[PDB]
């Protein structure tokens, strides 16, 4: 479907988004982390798997509602829903500095109010973050 396609559009982008990262081992791919939620998995899985996740160059993929590992030396991605709870996880992971980067990706149409929370959620620790486009804003 043309719709389901747009879903992967953002994904394939974030899952490959090579952002300004430091290179320690010359001659090594770009390891990127990902953090998905109930919806995030509801979209990433249908168009991605565990073996494909690591096969694309993922350093770690876990649920915001789980024990996140400390990988400040590797860029991270947060493809989740901008829900009240999620917004709290953003400021929770942003302050912990679990990952160097935080390529955010909202499933629904977040608002300036909720957005400011995540935007500032990082400002608290000054973590490099970037809110990507949404796909489920029309479906899912």
Curated annotation (Swiss-Prot):
Disulfide bonds: none
Alphabetical UniProt keywords: Cytoplasm, Endoplasmic reticulum, ER-Golgi transport, Golgi apparatus, Membrane, Phosphoprotein, Protein transport, Transport
Modified residues (Phosphoserine): 25
GO MF, one annotated term: protein-containing complex binding
Protein induction: Up-regulated in astrocytes upon reoxygenation after hypoxia.
Cellular component annotations (GO), alphabetically ordered: cis-Golgi network; endoplasmic reticulum membrane; Golgi cisterna membrane; Golgi membrane; Golgi-associated vesicle
GO biological process terms on file: endoplasmic reticulum to Golgi vesicle-mediated transport; intracellular protein transport; negative regulation of autophagosome assembly; post-Golgi vesicle-mediated transport; regulation of ER to Golgi vesicle-mediated transport; regulation of protein transport; response to hypoxia; response to toxic substance
Location in the cell: Cytoplasm; Endoplasmic reticulum membrane; Golgi apparatus, Golgi stack membrane
Recorded superkingdom: Eukaryota
Tissue: Highly expressed in testis. Detected at lower levels in brain, astrocytes, heart and small intestine.
Coarse class of the protein's main subcellular location: cytoplasm
Protein task: Plays a role in SNARE-pin assembly and Golgi-to-ER retrograde transport via its interaction with COG4. Involved in vesicular transport between the endoplasmic reticulum and the Golgi.
Subunit and partners: Interacts with STX17. Interacts with the COG complex via COG4. Interacts with STX5A.
Family: Belongs to the STXBP/unc-18/SEC1 family.
Protein name in the entry: Sec1 family domain-containing protein 1
Name of the gene encoding the protein in the UniProt record: Scfd1
Covered residues, full protein: 8 to 147 of 637
């Amino acid at each position: 479907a043309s719709i389901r396609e747009r879903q992967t559009v953002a994904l394939k982008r974030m899952l490959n988004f090579n952002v300004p990262h430091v290179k320690n081992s010359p001659g090594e791919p770009v390891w990127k982390v990902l953090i998905y939620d109930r919806f995030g998995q509801d979209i990433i899985s249908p168009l991605l798997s565990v073996k494909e996740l690591r096969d694309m160059g993922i350093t770690l993929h876990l649920l915001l509602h789980s024990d996140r590992d400390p990988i400040r030396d590797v860029p991270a991605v947060y493809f989740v829903m901008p829900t009240e709870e999620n917004i709290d996880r953003l400021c929770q992971d942003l302050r912990n500095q679990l990952y160097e980067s935080y390529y955010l990706n909202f499933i629904s149409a977040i608002s300036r109010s909720k957005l400011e929370d995540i935007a500032n959620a990082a400002l608290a620790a000054n973590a490099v973050t970037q809110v990507a486009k949404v796909f489920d804003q029309y479906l899912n």
